[PDB]
Design a binder for this molecule. Structure first.
Ligand SMILES: [Ca+2]
Ligand SMILES: [Ca+2]
Length: 134
C-alpha cells in the first residue's frame, strides 16, 4: 500500500475571473473519479496565490491512478467559477522520490489562460515520512 502526498504550493499567471476584481483561487484534488475530494483554502483577490497546503491520498494503483487538479475562482453566490485543470498520470513519479514541479493548466471554455500551479508530489509506502526521500 502506498500514499500520494501532495503539497499544493502556489499558482501564478492566473486569469482575471471577476470583471472588477482579480481571482479568488482555490484548488481541488481528485484521485481518479473518487468522491473523496480535497480542496485548499481560498486566497482572495490575487493572481499569485500561495497555499502551501498538504494532502495525503491513499493510492489504489501506483501506475494506473491519475491525479486531477482543478483550479476555481470562488464567487459570491451559490457557485464558483471554474478556471482550468490538469490531468497528472501518477506513473511518471518514481517511487519514493519527492518531485517539485510547475504544471500548465488547461483553461475551460471562455477562459483566456489557465495559469500554472506548483505541486510537490511524493509516492511513498504507507508509514514513511511524507515529503522526505524514501
Ligand atoms: Ca468570478
Ligand atoms: Ca471571484
Amino acid at each position: 500500500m502506498y500514499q500520494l502526498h501532495v503539497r499544493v504550493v502556489e499558482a501564478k499567471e492566473l486569469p482575471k475571473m471577476d470583471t472588477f476584481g482579480k481571482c479568488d483561487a482555490f484548488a481541488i484534488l481528485q484521485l481518479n473519479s473518487s468522491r473523496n475530494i480535497h480542496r485548499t483554502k481560498v486566497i482572495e483577490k490575487t493572481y499569485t496565490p500561495v497555499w502551501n497546503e498538504e494532502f495525503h491520498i491513499p493510492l489504489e494503483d501506483v501506475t494506473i491512478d491519475t491525479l486531477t487538479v482543478f483550479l476555481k475562482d470562488e464567487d459570491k453566490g451559490s457557485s464558483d467559477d471554474p478556471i482550468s485543470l490538469i490531468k497528472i498520470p501518477i506513473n511518471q513519479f518514481p517511487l519514493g522520490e519527492v518531485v517539485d514541479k510547475w504544471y500548465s493548466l488547461i483553461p475551460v471554455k471562455g477562459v483566456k489562460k489557465g495559469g500554472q500551479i506548483r505541486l510537490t508530489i511524493h509516492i511513498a509506502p504507507l508509514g514513511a515520512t511524507p515529503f522526505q526521500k524514501t
